[PDB]
Design a protein around this ligand. Structure first.
Ligand SMILES: [Fe+3]
Ligand SMILES: [Fe+3]
Ligand SMILES: [Fe+3]
Ligand SMILES: [Fe+3]
Lengths: 109, 109, 109, 109
């Protein structure tokens, strides 16, 4: 169901920067190879989870990329969110393409 | 229903930076006075629209801030999204607080 | 921004049924005249609020209708949700069409 | 990450009814044993996918249960959605509890 193998067009790449108490978490799908952004083929959303070591995954953010050509407006599948996270663990990003399903990426915090 | 009056704790502040073809759009609620982030009182989400002059508002992004204390994890009400926007108009941010309703901010593009 | 006038194709019609402690709340967009459900033109979501008399609007449900032709699958803009609501007030439904903007309907509880 | 084992409190139970061209799809979490609905412990959302045999999973609906005590209002983790689905396959429901992670249920169409 969820594809874990890396894919330049579909894999949601996670970058982590610690700014004081906040984690600055960048998620981008198609960073190096641009994914199409068309009404019938686009990256629709990304979910961000934090799974602290020894605990359940906690939903951190849900980002919907809503524009795909309406009046020539396009939302690129890239977002920056901010969270206070306690302890060590791994971030989990899940993204959805309207034709090619779901893709997952994990990155150690 | 929607409050348009400015409020330091609840108004979603919009910042715009043009990066190539993309508008880099930062939205933060409680920028100068931090809003509480508690299970029973928090900023839950922000909707971002672009209304080109003379046209209908186009939904650009929907961001849900999902963590509000679960395992001491907190999602800050701040997000950066990226969009291709055609023509002139105004951006519209709508944010929701679980106790004080909905708040709107407009910014000319 | 939000259109309040009734429209057979876009207005989210609210029906309310009381079942014990629960309100069974049906929302349908395009009840009498079906709205197109196409990649470039469809009803994307509906938000349901409850505004008790003299209080702030409380967000009750958010429903995203996600399929609009992918592999000939279509999500109809109709949903039934269930809530316990305290006191008297009105339900408020807001729906979004990817071409014709936002539409609002109110119904007294 | 996703829990597939049956659990009376957390598993999103799927029911399917064919009404003309439409599948009437009911999803309820905590059907036989009620799950807590509290600010710090509640069922937040359910995602519904359709995976036609030999194809990728198509996102059908996303339902957020938004009220968990705000002004004594509670959204129950139960929703009914409607979709036109082509061919045979299986429905996939994924639900999220703010403390006990993600839970999955599949049902043959
Ligand atoms: Fe794709
Ligand atoms: Fe507030
Ligand atoms: Fe329309
Ligand atoms: Fe639980």
């Amino acid at each position: 169901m969820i594809k874990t193998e890396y894919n330049p067009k579909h894999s949601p790449i996670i970058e982590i920067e610690k700014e004081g108490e906040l984690y600055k978490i960048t998620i981008e799908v198609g960073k190096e190879v641009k994914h199409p952004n068309e009404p019938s083929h686009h990256i629709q959303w990304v979910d961000l989870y934090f799974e602290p070591e020894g605990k359940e995954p906690t939903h951190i953010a849900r980002i919907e990329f809503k524009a795909h050509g309406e009046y020539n407006n396009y939302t690129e599948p890239k977002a920056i969110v901010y969270a206070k996270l306690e302890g060590k663990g791994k971030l989990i990003a899940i993204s959805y393409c309207t034709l090619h399903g779901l893709w997952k990426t994990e990155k150690e915090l």
